[PDB]
Amino acid sequence: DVVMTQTPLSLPVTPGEPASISCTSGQSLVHINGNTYLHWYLQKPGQSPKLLIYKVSNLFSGVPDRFSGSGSGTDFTLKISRVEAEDVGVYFCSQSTHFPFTFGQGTKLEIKRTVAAPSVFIFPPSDEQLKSGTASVVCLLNNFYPREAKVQWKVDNALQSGNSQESVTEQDSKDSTYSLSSTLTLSKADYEKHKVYACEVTHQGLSSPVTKSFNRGE
Amino acid sequence: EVQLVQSGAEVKKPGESLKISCQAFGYGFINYLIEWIRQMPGQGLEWIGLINPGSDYTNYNENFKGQATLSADKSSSTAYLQWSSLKASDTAMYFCARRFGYYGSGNYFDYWGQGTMVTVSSASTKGPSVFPLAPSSGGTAALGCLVKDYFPEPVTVSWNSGALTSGVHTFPAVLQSSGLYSLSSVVTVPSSSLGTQTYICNVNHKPSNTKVDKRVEPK
């Protein structure tokens, strides 16, 4: 199989600025018929992939001029002249020289904007859920940028690990922000024997960490 | 434009078989180079195989050979993908596509089916439990609904029957350590609206025919 490798994997771009995505193949994509079957796709959020550029550098009909491809052999580059909101999504290179056909890992292009601190909210478990024998404690980070944030759970000022799941939205297409949930899961037994539940949040938009907490019952 | 139409979501147990379809609503099917490509849950594309219905030529990704079978019904313009002994790792969005004309022709297309979601799990259909994420006690408040322990995907969440859409964040589902999905849906609102407006999350889970409208209230 011909391994396709894309760099980078994440590409923040400021609207109107250029973007480059590189693809390297494990071996030459020159076919015995003389053609080089390296293609570039964009998969916008929720959609199927769409073809941008075929055989290295041929703009597919209907695709905007701002997209262009170059390269030869094993090294290939997709360039976007001036990035726009409609350009967001995962870009894949695709080889069809050799069976089995293969794809790069994907390069996620997102809109770059200034750092924006998250608004933090902590939610205790409902009593209806406490009848279940389980306690879910939820922490929300709302409308922040960049994606990267550290969420630490502290239980009676003791730092939790492996006990919570994070979930993150796709980039909000209108304000270029992300939101994130961290759900801490405890047995009804473990929940009912501690007092302070704190969501601890670190992020570039905050000089020093934000902690939001509640005490069980109050 | 000529497009491809695929059959509906599949939910299967490990060990079971599958059969999904891809009908061309266009054109001439017998000359197509039809590819099957699956997209993994947060992942890349895995190329499954290719069929030209005309010849019955088939090429298979070695990893899926003797699990996967490509066939074509030339009478109904429909391509099929059969798959036996499904494994949990076969959980993916499956696409059919026409991308390439015969080599040397210079002809390129971009027809994609809408996708068929395939879920392979030993878990059984279960409706979600919906729990309130209560607004606690400045300018803006956040509230929501915890949608827990359902199977399979998908679930749908709206707020106030669709009347409320601004500031809404419905998170992606996460597969929990149990075989079961969980998600939350939140909305930020002005704090001044709390005493004044009601907030109901409308959670619908078609696979189990469960509809839950949960009223979310302060404390």
Rounded Cα distance, A143 and B51, in Å: 46
Type of residue numbered A115 = V
CB A46 within 8 A of CB A90: no
- Total length of chain A: 218
Q: How far is B67 from chain A (nearest CA, A)?
A: 16
Contact in structure between B214 and B132 (CB atoms under 8 Å): yes
CB A62 within 8 A of CB A40: no
Same domain as B104, residue B1: yes
Residue in A54, A106, A167 closest to B171 by CB: A167
**Residues whose CB is less than 8 angstroms from the CB of residue A4 and which lie 6 or more positions away in sequence, other chains included:** A23, A24, A25, A26, A93, A94, A95, A102, A103, A104, A105
| Strand-pair partners of A4 | A25
Distance CA A179, CA A119 (A): 9
Q: Are B23 and B61 found together in one domain?
A: yes
Q: Are B44 and A104 within 8 A, CB to CB?
A: yes
Which positions in chain B touch A142 (Cβ < 8 Å)? Answer: 142, 169, 186, 188
Q: How many CB atoms within 10 Å of residue B89?
A: 11
Closest CA of chain B from A57, distance in Å:
13
By DSSP bridging, strand A67-72 and strand B199-205 are unpaired
Q: How far apart are CA B40 and CA B37, in angstroms?
A: 10
For residue A66, count CB atoms less than 10 angstroms from its CB and return exposed for 0-12, middle for 13-18, buried for 19 or more: middle
Q: Looking at the structure, do residues B3 and B79 belong to the same domain, yes or no?
A: yes
Residues B79 and B70: their CA atoms lie apart, in Å, by: 7
Residue B82, both tokens: 């059969």
Q: How many domains does chain B have?
A: 2
Lookup result for tokens 């409208």: B213
Secondary structure of B171-197 in HEC code, one letter for each residue: CCCEECCCCCEEEEEEEEEEHHHCCCC
Closest residue to A181, CB basis, from B99, B140, B184: B184
Is A51–B47 a contact, with Cβ atoms under 8 angstroms apart?
no
Q: How far apart are CA B141 and CA B135, in angstroms?
A: 6
Whether residue A92 and residue B47 make contact (CB cut-off 8 A), yes or no, is: no
Domain A113-216 is found in CATH 1.20.140.10? no
Interface test with B, best of A48, A92, A143, A165 (most B CBs within 10 A): A48
CA angle A105, A48, A44 (to 5 degrees): 75
The one-letter amino acid code at B15 reads G
| Of the residues B122, B142, B173, the one at which a domain ends | B122
Way it was determined: X-ray
Can you give the residue ranges of every domain in chain A? 1-112, 113-216
Same domain, B7 and B98: yes
Q: If you write DSSP's letter for every residue of B7-55 in order, what string do you get?
A: PP-EEE-TT--EEEEEEE-SS-GGG--EEEEEE-TTS-EEEEEEEETTT
Give strand pairing partners of A164: A184
| Helix (H) / strand (E) containing B120 | strand B116-120
Does one domain contain both B106 and B127? Answer: no
Question: Residue B37 pairs with which residues in a beta bridge?
Answer: B47, B95
**Are residues B193 and B94 located together in one domain of the fold?**
no
Residues on chain B touching A125 (C-beta within 8 angstroms): 131
Contact criterion met (CB < 8 Å) for B186 and A31 = no
User: Are A1-112 and A113-216 in the same CATH fold?
Assistant: yes
Which of the listed CATH numbers 2.60.40.10, 3.30.360.10, 3.50.30.60, 3.90.1150.10 matches domain A1-112? 2.60.40.10
How many whole angstroms separate alpha carbon B18 and alpha carbon B15?
10
Report the alpha-carbon distance of residue A104 to residue A42 in Å, rounded: 12
- What is the C-alpha separation between B171 and B182, in angstroms, rounded? 9
C-alpha to C-alpha distance for B206 and B120, rounded to whole angstroms? 18
**Residue finishing a domain among B100, B122, B144:** B122
What are the structure tokens assigned to B63, written together? 């990893």
The answer to whether B86 touches B12, Cβ cutoff 8 Å, is yes
Chosen domain end from B67, B100, B122: B122
How near does any CA of chain A get to the CA of B50, in Å?
A: 9
Contact of B110 with A51, CB cutoff 8 Å: yes
Q: What's the CATH number where B168 sits?
A: 2.60.40.10
Q: For residue B166, which phi and psi values (nearest 5 degrees)? A: -70, 140
DSSP SS3 for B63: helix
CA count, 13 A, side-chain hemisphere, A178: 21
Chain A residues whose C-beta sits inside 8 Å of any chain B C-beta: 31, 33, 35, 39, 48-51, 54, 60, 92, 94, 96, 99-106, 119, 121-126, 128-129, 132, 136, 138, 140, 142, 165, 167-169, 179, 181, 183, 214
> CB atoms < 10 A from the CB of B190, how many?
13
Q: Identify the domain containing residue B196 by its residue range.
A: 123-219
Whether B153 and B164 share a structural domain: yes
Backbone angles phi, psi at B194, to 5 degrees: -60, -50
B109-113 long-range contacts, Cβ below 8 Å, gap at least 24? B110/A50, B110/A51, B110/A60, B111/B2, B111/B3, B111/B4, B111/B24, B111/B26, B112/A48, B112/A49, B112/A50, B112/B3, B112/B4, B113/A48, B113/B3, B113/B4, B113/B5, B113/B6, B113/B22
B47 and chain A in contact, CB less than 8 A: yes
- For chain A, the three-class secondary structure string (H helix, E strand, C coil) is CCCEEEECCEEEECCCCCEEEEEEECCCCECCCCCECEEEEEECCCCCCEEEEECCCEECCCCCCCEEEEEECCEEEEEECCCCHHHCEEEEEEECCCCCCEECCCEEEEECCCCECCEEEEECCCHHHHCCCEEEEEEEEEEEECCCCEEEEEECCEECCCCEEEEECCCCCCCCCEEEEEEEEEEHHHHCCCCEEEEEEECCCCCCCEEEEEECCC
Q: Which residue of chain B comes nearest to A41, CA vs CA?
A: B110
In chain B, which residue's Cα lies nearest the Cα of A97? B103
Classify the phi-psi angles of B15: left when phi > 0, otherwise alpha if psi is within -120 to 50, otherwise beta.
Answer: left
Per the CB < 8 A criterion, the answer to whether B93 and B126 are in contact is no
B129 shares its domain with B118:
no
- Judge: B169–A142 Cβ closer than 8 Å, yes or no: yes
Question: Contacts of residue B183 in chain A, CB cutoff 8 Å?
Answer: 167
Calpha distance B108→B102 (Å, rounded): 9
Neighbours of B49 (CB within 10 A): 21
Are B146 and A50 an interchain contact pair (Cβ–Cβ within 8 Å)? Answer: no
